[PDB]
Design a protein around this ligand. Structure first.
Ligand SMILES: *[C@@H]1O[C@H](CO)[C@@H](O[C@@H]2O[C@H](CO)[C@@H](O)[C@H](O)[C@H]2NC(C)=O)[C@H](O)[C@H]1NC(C)=O
Ligand SMILES: *[C@@H]1O[C@H](CO)[C@@H](O)[C@H](O)[C@H]1NC(C)=O
Ligand SMILES: *[C@@H]1O[C@H](CO)[C@@H](O)[C@H](O)[C@H]1NC(C)=O
Ligand SMILES: [Ca+2]
Ligand SMILES: [Ca+2]
Lengths: 140, 251
């Protein structure tokens, strides 16, 4: 048969009960009354066995979870979303050899981990109040 | 060309994986261990650089509540479903479920407290009320619970009437608002089959239809006895119409 009163995220198994879709959890395994609800599970939040890994953030979605490499890093394989740690391929951006930095002429692009900074050109003096080796460095 | 032990990040622990020394370009990731979770975009690992140099990591864990509580009244609004980090003071919205309505005096919000526990949930969404059931002419209705969403009402006919409809009716989500599964049934009175016509006996006051508890009266013709067998009345059993005794006889 088939049930005609299932909630938002279930499939009719018998005419008397429903079953939660994958990615969604219920407090019972058979949904007897329609006042019970299926809710989305938090694959990202604690405690979740799945861990995305390095330089990667988890993003809970309805019926799914997505790992993506944090900004300042990129995947090698181009594949943005992955499922557990063994698929992590996140690598730091060379912001220097890409030219998409914001240091000025008095400085030089300095590739770091997830970002960059600005060092004085060899033979250049940072103005006294400003600090060297930072994104707002000005030298003379 | 070598590496050494990784730093000690406060409130986090590295996954050494049983490595005494590390080659260059190896990377070890720290993990917030107890009550802490990672900031989005922060650096959770430190790679080993040339000359055994390790990258500097700012503390990237922070106090955090766990997942917003499961509520039967409502669910997390759409922006808030993706979030997995909840520092102290985090507000989250809520929207009422399919068969529920907002109680305007309350707040569709609850925030993270310094006890790493969410603020006490309130029932800011109450169940919808299906319309009033009405009244079955020549029939009863039993409302054991109430008209709120997800309650079944039963249907009953008065004696001598027969229902042609659904035994009960329950109220379920109907597009925007709630509504009853089954319309109101109809009670129709049972009719006794036909009045037997007596030989040499007139039947007083015939009507077009004869219902329940009705007694049909006989009289004998002139010169005929046994007018005192009385009359018969209309009885109904399990939807079948029966006359009580045999029809009286004229002699
Ligand atoms: C960790 O969480 C706390 C709040 O639980 C953040 O506190 C902020 O602190 C700054 C000053 O240091 C205040 O001006 C902000 O108003 C605070 N925000 C809140 C929501 O209380 C703290 O910054 C967090 N640490 C981070 C983000 O690294
Ligand atoms: C639902 O239907 C299946 C198959 O008809 C049955 O095995 C199961 O027991 C049913 N659930 C009940 C009766 O609660
Ligand atoms: C998790 O990673 C392991 C790596 O050993 C892989 O075999 C497995 O398929 C992954 N799990 C899922 C559900 O993809
Ligand atoms: Ca999910
Ligand atoms: Ca970089």
């Amino acid at each position: 048969g088939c049930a005609r009163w299932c909630p938002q995220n279930s499939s009719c198994v018998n005419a008397t009960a429903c079953r939660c879709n994958p990615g969604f959890s219920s407090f019972s395994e058979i949904i007897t009354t329609p006042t019970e609800t299926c809710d989305d599970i938090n694959e990202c939040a604690t405690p979740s066995k799945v861990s995305c890994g390095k330089f990667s953030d988890c993003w809970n979605t309805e019926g799914s979870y997505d790992c993506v490499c944090s900004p300042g890093y990129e995947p090698v394989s181009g594949a943005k979303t992955f499922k557990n740690e063994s698929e992590n391929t996140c690598q730091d951006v060379d912001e220097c050899s890409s030219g998409q930095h914001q240091c000025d002429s008095s400085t030089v692009c300095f590739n770091t981990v997830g970002s960059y900074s600005c060092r004085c050109r060899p033979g250049w003096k940072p103005r006294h109040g400003i600090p060297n080796n930072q994104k707002d460095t000005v030298c003379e | 060309s070598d590496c050494g032990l990784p730093p000690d990040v406060p409130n986090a622990q590295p996954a050494l994986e049983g490595r005494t020394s590390f080659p260059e370009d190896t990377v070890i990731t720290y993990k917030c261990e107890e009550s802490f979770v990672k900031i989005p975009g922060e650096k959770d690992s430190v790679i080993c650089l040339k000359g055994s140099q390790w990258s500097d990591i700012e503390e990237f864990c922070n106090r955090s509540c766990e997942v917003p509580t499961r509520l039967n009244s409502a669910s997390l609004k759409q922006p808030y479903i993706t979030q997995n980090y909840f520092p102290v003071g985090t507000v989250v919205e809520y929207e009422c479920r399919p068969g529920y309505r907002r109680e305007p005096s309350l707040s569709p919000k609850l925030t993270c407290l310094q006890n790493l526990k969410w603020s006490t949930a309130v029932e800011f969404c109450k169940k919808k009320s299906c319309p009033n059931p009405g009244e079955i002419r020549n029939g009863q209705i039993d409302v054991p619970g109430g008209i709120l969403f997800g309650a079944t009402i039963s249907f009953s006919c008065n004696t001598g009437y027969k229902l042609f409809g659904s035994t009960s009716s329950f109220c379920l989500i109907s597009g925007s608002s709630v509504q009853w599964s089954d319309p109101l049934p109809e009670c129709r009175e049972i009719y006794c089959p036909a009045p037997p016509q007596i030989d040499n006996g007139i039947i007083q006051g015939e009507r077009d239809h004869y219902g329940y508890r009705q007694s049909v009266t006989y009289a004998c013709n002139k010169g005929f006895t046994m007018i005192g067998e009385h009359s018969i009345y209309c009885t109904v059993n399990n939807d079948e119409g029966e006359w009580s005794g045999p029809p009286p006889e004229c002699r």
